[PDB]
Every structure is written in C-alpha cells, then in structure tokens.
Nucleic acid binder design. Structure first.
Ligand SMILES: Nc1ncnc2c1ncn2[C@H]1C[C@H](O)[C@@H](COP(=O)(O)OP(=O)(O)OP(=O)(O)O)O1
Ligand SMILES: [Ca+2]
Ligand SMILES: [Ca+2]
Length: 421
DNA sequence: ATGATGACGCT
DNA sequence: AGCGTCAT
C-alpha cells in the first residue's frame, strides 16, 4: 504494498530521429532517398569515416565508424554524402540547423530536454492530463495509434499483423473510466507522440522513432525496440519479463565500466537479476548513489527529471591529428588553434544573436603523442585571434621542447558558463 | 586513423 | 578547478 512506490507518476517520451545525418542529406538530394547510403567525413583516408548509415545500407552490414572503402566491400552500390569541410575541418552546421528544426516542433507539444543533436526527452504528464479531460471518458481507437507497439504483447505471421494484435489486446483491457490509471496515461501519451511524430515528418520530412514509458531510462530503452519510423510503449507491468532477459549493458549509463563491474562482482547477466539484492548490498558494491539507483531501476523505477533545456550548455570545436599528422611545430599549433577559434567565434556570434546569451569561459584541451590536459581562461570577447592567442598561452608551458614535443594529437576549444544577455 | 562533439560525476 | 565516465 500500500505504501510501495511504483514509479508510475509521470509520462515520459524519448524521440530519436532515424539515421539522422543520412535523412538530412536525403532530404537535400532526392537521388539518395530510399537507397543504401551513408554519411562520411573526410575522404582521403580509406574513403572517409562513416558517421551515419541508412537502414537499407545496414542490411548489408554497414556500420558506424566503418571506413567507407571497407563499407564498399560489403555494399558495392553504397551511396555517400560527405560532411562539409571548412577551415580544414569537419563542419557540422547543416545537422545542427536541422536539429533546431525538429526541436522547435517538439517544443510546441511539451517541455523538452535536448539529449543530443537528434534526441529529446519529453515530459508529457501535463499534456496527458489535459487530453484526458478533453476526451471525456471516450475509449481510445486503435486508429489513433497507427505506428505504436505495446512491448510484451500479443501474449498472423507478418510484422504489422503482430503489431495490431498486441495493440488490440492492450486497448481491449484498458480501464478508460479511471483518469488516474498509469496504463491509460501512457496510452494517451502514445497518442500525443503519434501526433508529434506526424508533425515532425509533415513539417521537416524527417522520420523518427520514440519510446513512451514512465521515466527516461525506460523511454530510451523502449525507443530502441522497434526502429525505424515506429514507437514503442513500455508499461510498468511489462518490466519484469522485459528485464528478465535484458543484458545489463543495454540500460542507459550501464554500457561502460559500472555495468561491467555489476556483471563481474554480482555474477549476473540480466537487469532483472538485480532484484534479488538488498538496497544496502548494491550500495556496498557500487556506492550510495549508484546502489540506490540500481535498486530502483531494476524494478522499473527512476526519478531523473526531464530537464527544461532545449539549447546546448557548451559550444565546442575540436580536431584530431592522428599518426604522422600530429602537430610538431609551434606555427602549426598556432594555425590550427586559430582555425578552431574562427569556427568557434562564428558559432558563438550566431548563438548570442539567436539565444540572448554570452559564454564567459573558454576551456582549452589538448592531447600529446581522450584528454591529456584541460586548462580554462576567461572569454571576454568573441574574437578568434584573441581566443586562439589565449588558448596558446594557457597550454604553451607544456611544450617539452619548430618545435613542439611531444607532438599534439588533439586540439579542443570549448565555450562554457553562459550568462543571459 | 574513427571524428566531432556534449552532459555530468568525483575529489 | 581538472580529470574521468558515458553517451550520440
Ligand atoms: N560517434 C559519433 N561520431 C560522430 N557523429 C555521430 C556519432 N554518433 C552519432 N553521430 C551523429 C550521426 C547520427 O546521424 C546522429 C544520431 O546518432 P544516433 O542516434 O546514435 O544514430 P542515427 O540517428 O544515425 O541512427 P539510429 O536510427 O540508430 O538512431 O548523430
Ligand atoms: Ca538517431
Ligand atoms: Ca540519437
């Protein structure tokens, strides 16, 4: 249980653009539409590195991080679009601007948290309440959920047939008389997300997938279950079966070292197996915060808020200088810091005009033959020569010595600490 | 020769 | 403040 919290207090969605950079290039160049294609950056080394892959190309085994020359061995008719290059480096402006298109549409429906260039969390709890009162007590037609999967259902032999059967079982057992039913609330959430996804596609051309659940972690997991161009509802009730065979690494934030340590120390494989440990046990192995989080998460419960944040908190530029291209002379170091600073100035000035804010700190980070060393200085003027000069100053004293030893394999300039303006 | 980003936690 | 983790 009577006092046992069930993590069913919110409706949260995660919207994720399908193969996003590919869709941006396909909208622009119709010749690429409905074809195996990929987006690459740079071209000289092994045809360039693939950074996005259409679903038609994925069927050939083409993946992210693949060299284009290698992808071509799997998929000889693979089509390619390449990232713009400016000032000697990859320039991602086209994709950031396409991102803004989508985020602005989503923000018409609800408060969003920008999670990445192509993902946003959506807190739908309020929107759902409103739609529930407007719908009187009327049942929800399957026609309102034309691209929705209900995870765990059903419980003919074609994929769409399965989808509908599952949706039918779900709707035919919904308690539409109870405006406080979590399952009803999720369902209405899914209706709204259908509407949001239709509006994005109508107004931009871009397709996306989505997950609808009671928190961000379940929403994100949900989103990945049926892709592309589909959405998945994960109810509280679906969690025990879903987690019983769900590898721990699939849950957001457990994909790395912590997740590996959970597996090794507890000697388990699946998210569900976490339930047999006390909260104190989990905290003993993984710390107070992680332990509490795991104990609740493996039961489908998570409280991280959808933060009201549509804009990035930092604006950064970086370039790697791998192998022999590593920077070995002072003049080399200065010229690239300047290149980075010039892109940074451009993006910052745009940012200040669009969003009425100004960055106040400049963070400089380098690697010598992830980050070796980060140093910050004040950012008082949007001027690329001053920023590049300042960046040099705060890193110049780590030259072991043109000449620059040891060679620099990465330069990175990041503007941070925004104040309103 | 992945590269280019971006949020947040720890001390 | 500077570094590490985890992610797209
Ligand atoms: N490691 C990376 N380096 C550079 N760019 C990336 C990287 N990961 C993702 N991106 C860019 C390209 C993607 O189009 C976009 C969104 O990433 P992500 O959602 O992980 O894949 P995706 O949108 O291409 O495919 P999916 O349909 O699987 O989401 O961000
Ligand atoms: Ca995506
Ligand atoms: Ca994404």
């Amino acid at each position: 249980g009577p006092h046992m919290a069930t993590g069913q207090d919110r409706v949260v969605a995660l919207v994720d653009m399908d193969c996003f950079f590919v869709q941006v290039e396909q909208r622009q160049n119709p010749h690429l539409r409905n074809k195996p294609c990929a987006v690459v950056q740079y071209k000289s080394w092994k045809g360039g590195g693939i950074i996005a892959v259409s679903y038609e190309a994925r069927a050939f085994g083409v993946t992210m991080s693949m060299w284009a020359d290698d992808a071509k061995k799997l998929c000889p008719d693979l089509l390619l679009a390449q990232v713009r290059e400016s000032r000697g480096k990859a320039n991602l402006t086209k994709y950031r601007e396409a991102s803004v298109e989508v985020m602005e549409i989503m923000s018409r429906f609800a408060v969003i948290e920008r999670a990445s260039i192509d993902e946003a969390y959506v807190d739908l709890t309020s929107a759902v309440q409103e739609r529930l009162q407007k719908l009187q007590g009327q049942p929800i037609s399957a026609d309102l959920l034309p691209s929705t999967y209900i995870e765990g259902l059903p419980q003919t032999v074609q994929k769409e047939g399965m989808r509908k059967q599952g949706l039918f079982q779900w709707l035919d057992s919904l308690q539409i008389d109870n405006l406080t039913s979590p399952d009803l609330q999720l369902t209405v959430g899914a209706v709204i997300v259908e509407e949001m996804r239709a509006a994005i596609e109508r107004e931009t051309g871009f397709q996306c997938s989505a997950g609808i659940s009671h928190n961000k972690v379940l929403a994100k997991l949900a989103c990945g279950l049926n892709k592309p161009n589909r959405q998945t509802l994960v109810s509280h009730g679906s969690v025990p079966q879903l987690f019983s065979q769900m590898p721990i690494r699939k849950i957001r934030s457990l994909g790395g070292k912590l997740g590996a340590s959970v597996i090794e120390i507890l000697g388990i494989e699946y998210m569900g197996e976490l339930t047999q440990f006390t909260e104190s046990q989990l905290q003993s192995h993984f710390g107070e915060k992680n332990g509490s989080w795991l104990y609740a998460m493996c039961r489908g419960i998570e409280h991280d808020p959808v933060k009201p944040r549509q804009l990035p908190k930092t604006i950064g530029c970086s370039k790697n200088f791998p192998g022999k291209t590593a920077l070995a002379t002072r003049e080399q170091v200065q010229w690239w810091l300047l290149q980075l600073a010039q892109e940074l100035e451009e993006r910052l000035t745009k940012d200040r005009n669009d969003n009425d804010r100004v960055a106040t700190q400049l963070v400089v980070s380098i690697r010598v033959q992830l980050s070796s060393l980060r140093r910050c200085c004040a950012l008082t003027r949007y001027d690329a020569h001053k920023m590049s000069h300042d960046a040099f100053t705060v890193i110049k004293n780590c030259n072991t010595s043109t000449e620059w030893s040891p060679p620099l394999t990465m330069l990175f300039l990041c503007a941070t600490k925004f104040s309103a303006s």
